[PDB]
Subunit: 245 residues, 3 copies
C-alpha cells in the first residue's frame, strides 16, 4: 500500500488568540509563535484564524474550532471565561503557552485552576535562560521522537503550588531538570518539582511553560515538541482524528 | 611533529549551481546555502564559483572543478545533462540537496535515476517540520563526529521508490527515524524506509534530502553534517586528497 | 520553606572589556556577546559596565567588580597588565573568551601564561566550523546540567603548547572531541589534546575557547554553558556568594 495520505481540503479549524496588553516579551513570543503556526499552514493543511479579541467568540462561535491556541493570556471577562468553559466541557481543544496559565489570588476563576490541574503561580527564575529538560514519558505521541533530555532555548520558567504532578488526572510530559538548581541570576529557584509540559486528562488540552522573548524558535528540538503538542491535541478530537481523512 | 597543515594557496575548485526558476522555499535555501559555503571560503581555502546558468558549463569547463554543489535542481536540457554525465563518469564530484534529486515519470533521464541509486520520487510530508534523524554508519567520515541521533531543523522530506537502500552500490549514511511516524499535518507519511543522506559508491557523490526554506542553518549539528558531506566528497578526488597538500 | 530567592537590589558588579582593534570576526563576537550579557541583566540582577578602554581601569577602579568579562583581547600595556595582575591576585574574577587568551613568543607577559595554565598558542583550524565537544567533568557547577556531548556552533578553535590539561592546577571542563580529526578545510589540525573550557584553580577564573563570528548564540546548549561559566565565577567571590543575598 501507498504510505502517504495527501489532504484534499483543510483537515480542521484552529483559532489563535493572543493579547497585546501584556509584557513586551510575551507579545514578542505571541507574534513569532503566530508566524510558526502560519508556516505550518503553508498550503492550507488546516484553517487558521487569528484574533486579539476573544470577546467576539461566544461558545456557539468557538464550536467550529478543533483547537484554540492561547499564546500569552487567558479570558479575563465573565462572558469570555464562560464561552471557554462551555467549549472545553463539550470536547474543545486547547494548546496553552507560558502566561496563558498564569493565575494568582486575584484571578477569581476556580474552574480554570481546576482545568490546569490545580496549580496556582508560585515562583519563577530570572533572567530568562536555557535549561536542561527531561522527557517524563517516552511512549507518548508528544515525546516519542524527542531525545530523553535536551537543552531548551531561553525562557522564564514557572513553578506552581500545588505542583500539577500532584493531580491524579494530570500527566506530566516534560520537566525542567533538578540538575539546573540553583536556577537564576536575579531571582533564584533552589528546589522543588518543576514540570513544564503537561496535560489534564479530563480535557483535550496541553500546556507548555515556554513562551517568553524573541528566541523561542532557534532550536529544532523545541520546535518539534511544539509541532507534536499541536498535532496530538488536534488528533484527539472526539468527532474523529482529522489526520485520517 | 606539528599537528597542523596550513594551506599555502587554495586547495581545490568548487562550483555552486542553483536556479531561480523554482518554488520560493527552494530559492531561499539555495541563497542561504550559498552564504554558508561563502563563509567556508573566508580566507580562500578553495576557489568557489557560483552560477544560476548550467548551460555555460560543457564537460571541458566542468573538468576544472573538484566538486559541483547543486542546491535546488538538476540539469534539464540534453546538453546540460550530457556535460554532467561526462563529468561524473570521469571522476567529478557532486553534493546534491533536496529538489536537486527530484525525478518522476516525466524526467526522462535514466542515467540520473541510476546515478542517484534508482530512487524515483514516491511521497513527502507537508508542512516542513523538524524530525528525529539517525546515523546509519557511525564509522564513516561524514558521520564520525555526529551524535547517533538528533533532531534536524524543519524541511520537507522525500521518500523514493525503490528506496536507495535497496541498491547494492548505495551506502545510506542518515535516516529519518520511524519514531516520527505518522509524519505530517497536511500530507501524512505513515510508514516505509526513509533514508535522507546517501552515496552511490560508483561515483564521488553525496545526496542530502534537507534543503527547504529560510531556517536550514539554525542548527549546529546539521551544519556539521553539511561541512562533513562537502569535505568527504572533496577529499576522495582521484588526482589526490586536497587536504593533504 | 519557599524555594525562591528574589533579589531586592543588584547582586554584584560586572565589567565587560573588548577592543575594536581586532579581526572583524572577533569584534562581531564581542558585540553579540555584549547583547547576550545585557539580556542577562534585564531587570538589573547585577550592575553591568561596558568599556573598550582598559587603560581607564587601574586596580583602584577594578576592585569594585566581582568579575571582568574579556571578550576578544587581554591587557597590552604594563600599566593595564599590572592592574589586572593585582586584581586577580586579590580575589578578582575573570571570564575569558577565544582571543582574550592568545599569547605567543612576542607577548612577554609570563604572569599571564602562568595564569592561563601554561599554554602558549600552538595552532588552529580554518575556516570556523561546528565541532563535537565533550564534558570532561559532569559533577562541576559549569557542566552539571549540560549533555555529556554536543555539537558546539561554528568557531575558529585553538590548540596550546603545553596543553592546559598538563597543569596540575588546571581543571579541564570541556574538550573538542578527537572524533573531529582531521579538522579543517583550509588549515587542518590532525591530532593532539584539544581542551576548550578550563579553569586555573589558583584563580577565580574560567576560559572558553569559542568566540568567533556572528553566529555564536544560535545554540541553546552553548548559551547554557556561557550562563553557567559566568554564574560559577561570580558565585565564588571570597566576600560571599552573591546569589545567597
Amino acid at each position: 500500500g501507498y504510505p502517504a495520505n495527501y489532504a484534499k481540503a483543510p483537515r480542521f479549524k484552529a483559532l489563535i488568540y493572543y493579547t497585546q496588553h501584556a509584557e513586551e516579551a510575551h507579545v514578542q513570543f505571541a507574534e513569532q509563535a503566530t508566524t510558526f503556526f502560519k508556516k505550518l499552514n503553508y498550503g492550507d493543511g488546516f484553517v487558521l484564524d487569528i484574533t486579539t479579541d476573544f470577546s467576539k467568540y461566544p461558545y456557539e462561535k468557538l464550536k467550529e474550532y478543533n483547537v484554540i491556541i492561547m499564546l500569552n493570556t487567558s479570558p479575563n471577562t465573565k462572558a469570555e471565561r464562560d464561552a471557554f468553559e462551555q467549549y472545553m466541557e463539550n470536547g474543545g481543544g486547547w494548546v496553552g503557552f507560558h502566561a496563558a496559565a498564569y493565575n494568582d489570588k486575584n484571578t477569581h476563576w476556580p474552574w480554570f485552576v481546576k482545568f490546569l490541574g490545580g496549580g496556582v503561580f508560585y515562583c519563577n527564575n530570572w533572567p530568562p535562560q536555557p535549561v536542561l529538560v527531561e522527557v517524563d514519558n517516552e511512549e507518548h505521541p508528544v515525546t516519542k521522537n524527542l531525545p530523553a533530555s535536551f537543552v531548551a532555548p531561553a525562557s522564564e520558567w514557572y513553578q506552581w503550588t500545588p505542583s500539577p504532578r500532584q493531580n491524579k488526572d494530570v500527566e506530566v510530559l516534560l520537566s525542567l531538570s533538578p540538575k539546573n538548581y540553583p536556577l537564576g541570576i536575579k531571582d533564584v529557584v533552589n528546589f522543588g518539582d518543576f514540570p513544564i509540559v503537561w496535560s489534564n486528562k479530563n480535557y483535550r488540552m496541553i500546556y507548555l511553560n515556554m513562551g517568553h522573548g524573541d528566541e523561542e524558535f532557534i532550536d529544532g528540538t523545541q520546535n518539534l515538541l511544539l509541532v507534536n503538542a499541536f498535532r496530538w491535541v488536534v488528533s484527539k478530537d472526539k468527532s474523529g482524528n482529522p489526520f485520517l481523512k
